[PDB]
Every structure is written in structure tokens, then in C-alpha cells.
Symmetry: D2
Subunit: 213 residues, 4 copies
Amino acid sequence: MKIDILDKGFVELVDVMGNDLSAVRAARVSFDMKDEERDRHLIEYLMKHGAETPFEHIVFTFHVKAPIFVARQWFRHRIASYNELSGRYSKLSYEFYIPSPERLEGYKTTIPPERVTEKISEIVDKAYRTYLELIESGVPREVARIVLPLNLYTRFFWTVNARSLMNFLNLRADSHAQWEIQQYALAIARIFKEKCPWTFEAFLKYAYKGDIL
Amino acid sequence: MKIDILDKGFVELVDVMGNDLSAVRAARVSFDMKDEERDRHLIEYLMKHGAETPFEHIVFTFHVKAPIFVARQWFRHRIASYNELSGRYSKLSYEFYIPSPERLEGYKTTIPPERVTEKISEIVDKAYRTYLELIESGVPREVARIVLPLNLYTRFFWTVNARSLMNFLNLRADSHAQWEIQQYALAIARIFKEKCPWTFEAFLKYAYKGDIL
Amino acid sequence: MKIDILDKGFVELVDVMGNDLSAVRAARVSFDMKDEERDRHLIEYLMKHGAETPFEHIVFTFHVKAPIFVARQWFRHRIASYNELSGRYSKLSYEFYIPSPERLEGYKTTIPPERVTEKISEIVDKAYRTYLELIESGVPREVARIVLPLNLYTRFFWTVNARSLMNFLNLRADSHAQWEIQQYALAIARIFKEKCPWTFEAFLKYAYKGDIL
Amino acid sequence: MKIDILDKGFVELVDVMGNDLSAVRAARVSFDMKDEERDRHLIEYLMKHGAETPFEHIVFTFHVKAPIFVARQWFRHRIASYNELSGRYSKLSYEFYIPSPERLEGYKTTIPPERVTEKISEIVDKAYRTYLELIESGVPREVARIVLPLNLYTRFFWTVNARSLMNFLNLRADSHAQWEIQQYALAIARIFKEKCPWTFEAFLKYAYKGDIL
Ligand SMILES: Cc1cc2nc3c(=O)[nH]c(=O)nc-3n(C[C@H](O)[C@H](O)[C@H](O)COP(=O)(O)OP(=O)(O)OC[C@H]3O[C@@H](n4cnc5c(N)ncnc54)[C@H](O)[C@@H]3O)c2cc1C
Ligand SMILES: Cc1cc2nc3c(=O)[nH]c(=O)nc-3n(C[C@H](O)[C@H](O)[C@H](O)COP(=O)(O)OP(=O)(O)OC[C@H]3O[C@@H](n4cnc5c(N)ncnc54)[C@H](O)[C@@H]3O)c2cc1C
Ligand SMILES: Cc1cc2nc3c(=O)[nH]c(=O)nc-3n(C[C@H](O)[C@H](O)[C@H](O)COP(=O)(O)OP(=O)(O)OC[C@H]3O[C@@H](n4cnc5c(N)ncnc54)[C@H](O)[C@@H]3O)c2cc1C
Ligand SMILES: Cc1cc2nc3c(=O)[nH]c(=O)nc-3n(C[C@H](O)[C@H](O)[C@H](O)COP(=O)(O)OP(=O)(O)OC[C@H]3O[C@@H](n4cnc5c(N)ncnc54)[C@H](O)[C@@H]3O)c2cc1C
Ligand SMILES: O=c1ccn([C@H]2C[C@H](O)[C@@H](COP(=O)(O)O)O2)c(=O)[nH]1
Ligand SMILES: O=c1ccn([C@H]2C[C@H](O)[C@@H](COP(=O)(O)O)O2)c(=O)[nH]1
Ligand SMILES: O=c1ccn([C@H]2C[C@H](O)[C@@H](COP(=O)(O)O)O2)c(=O)[nH]1
Ligand SMILES: O=c1ccn([C@H]2C[C@H](O)[C@@H](COP(=O)(O)O)O2)c(=O)[nH]1
Ligand SMILES: [Cl-]
Ligand SMILES: [Cl-]
Ligand SMILES: [Cl-]
Ligand SMILES: [Cl-]
């Protein structure tokens, strides 16, 4: 499962361990212990009571392409594993997030939204040109990259269990989160739902704290 | 894969996500990047330099049956997920770890090792008899169980990534750890080796800190 | 601050870093930023919205004496630091939790609550006698202790931040938790309230999930 | 204690809990247990054997001003607490890290190091000018800031225990880490040494893995 996000981003599921029954088993190993009706009720019971440790036995790995300002927010989720493309080690690609003019809907601006779009493209092009000039002059990559803007795309692998994923969705699939990461959270939710439908529906009904899903 | 440990214990692998190539990929997503020779060298490189985050993308779930004193030590490993049979909720089974007389090899004792074995069996039988008397009298399980000894068997599910597993092996597959948990660690190592042979061999060669493997 | 718990237990505050203003500062370093009215409102704002990271900058260390079955439950809180008296290394003291007859109020039993109390004392005395016999015969401590019951007292140091402490109180200062750990949680709450009154009151009003405080 | 880093950065100690004796106590609560000679030997013993949990009972809070590319690397240390100035919420200040010409010593470049310095200043000035134009036109701050470069200064509070701090120093006070974060790590080390001299010296002698301290 792969989902395009923003203008050049994506979220892709690379691997998964377990399913809804993984949580039911782990939880049962407590009672020294059925059928779809009872196992689904147990999932709802756990979710209703905040007994979320059993969901840690469901694990996902995603490959994500996102702008640096989005990745900065995402990487604040400490209960997870990350490995990210390095600007110290690699030549960084010319790929930037340019907001669509619709991104400014609701805001009165004193320059046209299409001109905001152009101004962002222009500065990012100038910054990349400076970056490449520095690189081609023999400046180390790790220094050259410091002129690149926060809308540069980066890529990372993310391994996260279902409990920590539900925390991420509470926080990022929510109107208070920046719109850009919301869009990534909606994609993560769609994949979670596909892989763990009983857990996801129980999450939405009983535990999900956000206002978008 | 299932392995008998001690007199009545076991370690069983329930599920696994990923393999040696999972770490190679995750690490490559850094260099914006081969073949078995190069991928194996990368694993050794990571291990040699303590660059262990890529191994967090390999995850295991085990089902473990072990005495409570072993589980107490094991559950000190915080970077992992656990769910354990409950004495508050369930009637606990009559199953205790009784050391073999060989457990005392090296120790001069003033009672015969076979008599130590009998004395342990006798007290555990008396404790269980009291437990069952309390339960059958209407004492709540969560109170009745407090008379049961630390050699009572318990069971748990353990979900752990390969980096945290390597930490566990450093500490528990080692002569300083109690012999009983060492035996469980040897089983965990055998399963890790089977599932992740390049990572395991690189671990032993370059990073493993213990003295048994 | 020290508080007696159960028959022989205690909770003592050893050290603390920070106060209510530590969370206000840390949070302000977000807005590049007052007075008691505004700082108290900010605390309530954070608590109301689940924005709890600023409370991680308040840290406590406690010294706790508790029975092993209580410590087993407590040590499940992974987002904290522990060091505990060892039965491998030390001769363990004759100190056991014996429930009061009032512990069984609400339960119809077919033996008198005072006789349950005596039966627990009797088995614990027999177990300790076996332990000491094994120790005095030259059995290693780490093996001898396996006959000791779960109501043996142990001691530990616990270092925990205020966010993780609030999680502990949600779970353990609650009717669903075993009564014995509830009593320890009530003591932890009393100390937290004394040290962080604005945070504590905001916690109770807006975020606390339990039913006892 | 406050230390200037780079051209406009700093590291300041805001608060601390505990000292070398905090680790000695916590560790002793294991043996159910002296003087400066014995307590210092215990610290060395723990460090020599990797028995580092007792050092988690020493905790620091720092206030750090650093460029975003440095903060991105720093915030990868998950076993710690962070709160950072927000570009969604605040107008960001015109403050950028401009490397000194000495930063390029060892590198043959085909433009003079002083001209690299000027090219970096020029692009950062243009990016900030665009940022301010967007802000003053009514573009939301959270969108306007995406044009700002990675050498923008940010500020954060960091609360970290001594074990996690030692991990940070292993990784960041080391020639493999980017020079800029090395400079911050050297400052963190100087403060750690001042506050915990026995732990620090034992760390350097027995456990420190880097090549700078
Ligand atoms: C709308 C919004 C605005 C934000 N604004 C800012 C801002 O201005 N500045 C800023 O710095 N950050 C900001 N954040 C980031 C925020 O403070 C969190 O870092 C982020 O939401 C991750 O949440 P988390 O800690 O629950 O997740 P994780 O770090 O994944 O932790 C998951 C859970 O584990 C626990 N946990 C993990 N580590 C610890 C620990 N050390 N102590 C206690 N419990 C722990 C907690 O229960 C936590 O919920 C903002 C986030 C949101 C959604
Ligand atoms: C021979 C031996 C004797 C022992 N004796 C005692 C004893 O007498 N008393 C006792 O209480 N315990 C004892 N232990 C337990 C020991 O203190 C550790 O709790 C256990 O070994 C788990 O190690 P860990 O913290 O590295 O693992 P985990 O808790 O799984 O942590 C893994 C890694 O994550 C990091 N980490 C996780 N949480 C934190 C945190 N909060 N702060 C900083 N870093 C963190 C560290 O890098 C750590 O190595 C003993 C263990 C051994 C092997
Ligand atoms: C009434 C009651 C009955 C219980 N019954 C049982 C039982 O029968 N069997 C049993 O084994 N346990 C049982 N528990 C223990 C329970 O499953 C938890 O281990 C314990 O409550 C600690 O909760 P916690 O994980 O939130 O705390 P911590 O481990 O301190 O974690 C704090 C927060 O950090 C986050 N976190 C930390 N580590 C991870 C991780 N690896 N993945 C995702 N998020 C993480 C979560 O947000 C978590 O809330 C019971 C607890 C209660 C209160
Ligand atoms: C020279 C250098 C180059 C780097 N290059 C890259 C790169 O190219 N791309 C990139 O993404 N990152 C890179 N990093 C970052 C690196 O991968 C680590 O994220 C960073 O060094 C923090 O290390 P840590 O995980 O030990 O620290 P923390 O996250 O603070 O963890 C401390 C300890 O807790 C344990 N721990 C915590 N969480 C877990 C977990 N979930 N599972 C298992 N154990 C855990 C481990 O024992 C760990 O050592 C680089 C770092 C260095 C120093
Ligand atoms: O919605 C937010 C706002 C902030 N942050 C974290 C990420 C950065 O570490 C820091 C500043 O982020 P920005 O506000 O500049 O995006 O706070 C988030 O995680 N999410
Ligand atoms: O080898 C050891 C010794 C101790 N402990 C931890 C587990 C308990 O929380 C506490 C006391 O354990 P025992 O020494 O009693 O096994 O310290 C271990 O994890 N491993
Ligand atoms: O209320 C509870 C019940 C269980 N457990 C955890 C602790 C043990 O690891 C395991 C079994 O505990 P008991 O039910 O036997 O107390 O589950 C708790 O933390 N709290
Ligand atoms: O020395 C390094 C190199 C990388 N990273 C982490 C931080 C970012 O999340 C990602 C890319 O960092 P840069 O290589 O671009 O600095 O990897 C570090 O923490 N330290
Ligand atoms: Cl390109
Ligand atoms: Cl039985
Ligand atoms: Cl005694
Ligand atoms: Cl300014």
C-alpha cells in the first residue's frame, strides 16, 4: 500500500507484523485463555478501558517522503524507530514542497495566492543554486546543505507499534496539527484501518481524541 | 521454533518482522541507496561502529514460560513490550521450578544437594496448599496468591526489536547473570541466529559484550 | 516527606527537580516567551489539551518499601528508572505483608478473616525458615530465595518525571488497580500535590482518568 | 553555568537533580547498604561493568540555542525530554549560523573561504526577506517559515539523565559527529564534569567511546 501526499510526497507500507488477533493473543497469553464475536469484544474492551499494551504487539514499517518541516514534527514521536536520508553523507535532490494556492483558503492576503506560490519557488530555486555552487566548489556537503530551506523533501523509514501509532493519530490526525502533517496522518490511518480493522474501528469509537477521522 | 528451558519452561517464537535485509534497507532508506557481499559488509560496518538504529526495524514476538524470579529480571528490560498471565484475574497453576541437584555443582553444602531439592519441593507444595485453601474459602485471588513462592511459573508474550534483543543478550547471555536466565538467553540467541544470521554473526564478532556466546 | 503504607511499607521523597514553574518555562523556552494568574492558566491549558511534554521537566526520586507483588505491578511502568534490593546479592530480611482482617471486607469467606491472617503468617514463617536453612547450609542466595513468597518486602529507588507520574496515578490511583498499590499511589499523589500544586489540581480537574483522587 | 557556542549559540544549565552520591545511593538503595574512597570505587565499578542504571537518578535541564541542522541531530536522542520554540506559533528571529572561514580548513575549494561565508550570508538574507514579505502579506506563519534555511537558530529546553547524557557524549563528542554538534557536546561535557566529577572521570576512564574528550 502506497499513498501520494502533497505535491511530491508519499507514505508506503514496507512491512507489518501481526494483526488484530496479535493483540487478542498477547492479552490472553492474563486470564490464562475464542471466536470473532468474543475477540472483537475484547478489542473494544481494551480500547474502552485504556488497556493498550496488547496493541504494542502489532508493528508497522513505513517508508515516508516528506518535507523537512513535516519530518521535524513527526520525529518528535520518540516511541518509534527512524532512519533518514543524510545531508552530511548524500547530495540532496532538488525536490521541494510548494503549497498549492488552495493552501491559503480562509486567509486574506495582500498578495495573490498564486504570487505567494511563485515567491516560494523562486527562493527555493536560489537556495538550491547556492547549495550546488558550494558543493561544486569543494565545500563539504554537511556545510553546504545549511542554506537549504525547510520545505526540502527528505525520506525515512519509520517502525512503530500500533499503540504508539494511535498516539500519533490522536495528535496528528487532528485540526490542531499543521495541515501538511495531517495529510500524512490521514494516509497512515487508511493503512492502519486496512491492516487492523477491528482495532481501528474500536480506536475511533472509544479512544481516538482527534477531530478529523 | 520452540525450545524447552529448565524443568518446565520454554521459549517459543510467535512472530517476526523483517530479516537482515530489513536493517540494510532502513539504513539505506542515509546515502540515498546492493548484493550479498556488500550488504553483509554494511551490517558488519554498522555493528563495528555502534550504529545500531537500523536493527530496530527487525522485530520479534516470543511466548515465554519462566519462573517469576526469572521474569522479574527479564521485565527490567524496558525497551520492549510485555503481557503476562495475571494472579489477580486467573487461578494460578501448580507448576514450580525445582532446581536439579547439578544446580549446586561447585558449592560445598552441609546438606546433600538431593535434600535441598526435596526441601524446595516440600515448601512449594505447602504454599500451594495454603493458596488453594484460601481460594476455596472465598479469599480473593489477588490476596490468596501472595503466599506463592518466586519459583512459580508464569507466562508472557514479549515483543522486542533486534537492537534491544542484542542488549538483552549482552546482559543475560553472560556469566554475571543468574544461571536460570542465562539458559533462556541462550534460547533467545539460537532463535535470533536462525532468523538473522548476518546480524547475529556480526553481533558476536564486533559488539557482543558477554562471555557465553 | 515520608508516608507509612500497609503494615511495614513506606514511600519517601528523596529528591525533586523543578516545580510548577519548570513546566511553564520549558513550554515557553514555543511562543518565544508572566504572573501567577497567567502561569496557572497555561498549566490548565496544557493539561486540558493533553499537551503534557512540558511536565517532563519536573522530576522526582522516591524510596519505596513494598511487597514484591506490588513492586511487580509498579515496575511495569517503563518510563521511569528503578534500582532495587537484590536477592542474588543480599540476605533478605524477615518482613512480610500480612493483610489486616479488614482487607476481606465485602467478601463472604468460609473461614474467619482472622484465621486467613494466621494462615498467611504461618506459611510465610515456614518459607522463611526454609530459606534460612538453605542459606545456612551453603546454598547460594540466588537459589535459596526462590522459596520466598510474593508478600516479602523489597525496597527500591524510583526516579520518574511528572508526566509519567500522572500516567501512574491514572492507572494505580484507581479502583481497578489492586488495593495494595492503590494505597502507595495515594501517597505518591499526596507528595506530588505538595510539590506541584498547580499541576496537580489541573491534573485532577482536566486529565486524571481514575476514580479515587 | 553558561557557555557560548558557534557564532550566536549557547548551552546553559537551568537545573540539576542529584550528584555523584545520588547514583551511589540508588545503587545501594542492591546490597542492602560508605566513605569517599569506597563510593568513588563503586562509581568506577559500575562504569567498568556497564551497570549504568544507577546514573539515571542524576538529571539535568539545559537551555540550548543552536541552528536547526544541529537541533535535528540532537533531537534524535529519544531518551530525553524536549520543548522547542515553534515556527507555527512565533515570528522567528533573524539569527543564522554563518561558518567562520576556518570551518573549511583542510578542504581545497575553488572559491575562497571568505567568499563561501558571503554566499551563505547572502542567501540567508534573501530567504529571511521572503519570509518576512510572506508574513507581512498575511500568509500564516506555519507556511511562511518553510522558506527559511537549516542554519536558522532555534532554542529548546532539554531534560536528560546522566546515562542518556553519557550516550549523547559517546556519539556527539566524537570526530564522526558533525563539527558543529561536537562543539555543543564539548560544552555539555564541561557542565557534566563540573556537576558530577567522579561519574565523569569514571566515564572517561572506563566507558567513553568517543575520540575527543
Ligand atoms: C498541535 C501540536 C503543537 C505542538 N507544539 C510544540 C511546540 O511548540 N514545541 C515543541 O517542542 N513541541 C511541540 N509539539 C510536539 C509535542 O510536544 C510532542 O513532542 C509530540 O506531540 C509527540 O507526542 P508524545 O510525547 O505523546 O509522543 P512520543 O514521544 O512518541 O511518546 C509517546 C508516549 O510515551 C510517553 N513518553 C515517551 N517518552 C516520555 C518521557 N521521556 N517522559 C514521559 N512520558 C514519555 C508519553 O505517554 C507519550 O504520550 C506539538 C505537537 C502538537 C500535536
Ligand atoms: C548481572 C546483573 C545484576 C543486576 N543487579 C541489579 C540489582 O541488584 N538491582 C536492580 O534494580 N537491577 C539489577 N540489574 C538490572 C539492571 O540494572 C538493568 O535494569 C537491566 O540489566 C536492564 O538493562 P537496560 O537498562 O540496559 O535495558 P532496558 O531497560 O531495555 O534499556 C535498554 C537501553 O535503553 C536505554 N534506556 C532505557 N530507558 C532509559 C532511561 N530511562 N534512561 C536512560 N537510558 C535508558 C539504555 O541505553 C539502555 O541500555 C541487574 C542486571 C544484571 C545483568
Ligand atoms: C487494572 C490493571 C490491570 C493490569 N493487568 C495486567 C495483566 O493482566 N497482565 C499484564 O501483563 N499487565 C497488566 N497491567 C499492566 C499494564 O498492561 C501496563 O503495563 C501498566 O499499566 C503500565 O502502563 P503504561 O504502559 O501506560 O506505562 P509505561 O510503561 O510507564 O509507559 C508510559 C507511556 O509510554 C508509552 N509507552 C512506553 N513504552 C511503549 C512502547 N514500547 N510502545 C508504545 N507505547 C509505549 C505509552 O504511551 C504509555 O502509556 C495491568 C495494569 C492495570 C492498571
Ligand atoms: C556520526 C553519526 C551519523 C548518523 N547518521 C544518521 C543517518 O544518516 N540517518 C539517521 O537517520 N540517523 C543518523 N544518526 C543518528 C543515529 O542513528 C541515532 O539516532 C542517534 O545517534 C541517537 O542514538 P541513540 O539511538 O543511541 O540515542 P537515543 O534515541 O537517546 O536512545 C538511547 C538508547 O536507548 C535505546 N533505545 C531507545 N529507543 C530504542 C528503541 N526504540 N529500540 C531499541 N533501543 C532503543 C538504545 O540502547 C539507545 O542507545 C547518526 C548519528 C551519528 C552519531
Ligand atoms: O505542530 C507542531 C508544532 C511543533 N512541533 C515540534 C517540532 C519541532 O521540534 C518544534 C518546532 O516545530 P514547528 O512549530 O517549527 O513546526 O516543535 C511539533 O512536533 N508539532
Ligand atoms: O541479575 C539480576 C539481579 C537483579 N535484577 C533486578 C530484578 C529485580 O527488579 C531486582 C532484584 O532481583 P533479584 O536480585 O532479587 O533477582 O533487580 C536483574 O534484573 N537481574
Ligand atoms: O493490576 C495489575 C495486574 C497485573 N499487572 C502486571 C504485573 C505483572 O507483570 C503481571 C501479573 O501481575 P499480577 O496480576 O499477578 O499482580 O501483570 C499489573 O501491573 N497490574
Ligand atoms: O551526524 C548525524 C547525521 C544524521 N543524523 C540524523 C538527523 C536527521 O534526522 C537525519 C539526517 O541528518 P543530516 O545528515 O542531514 O544532518 O539523520 C544525526 O542525528 N547525526
Ligand atoms: Cl537533483
Ligand atoms: Cl493446577
Ligand atoms: Cl531478618
Ligand atoms: Cl528579528
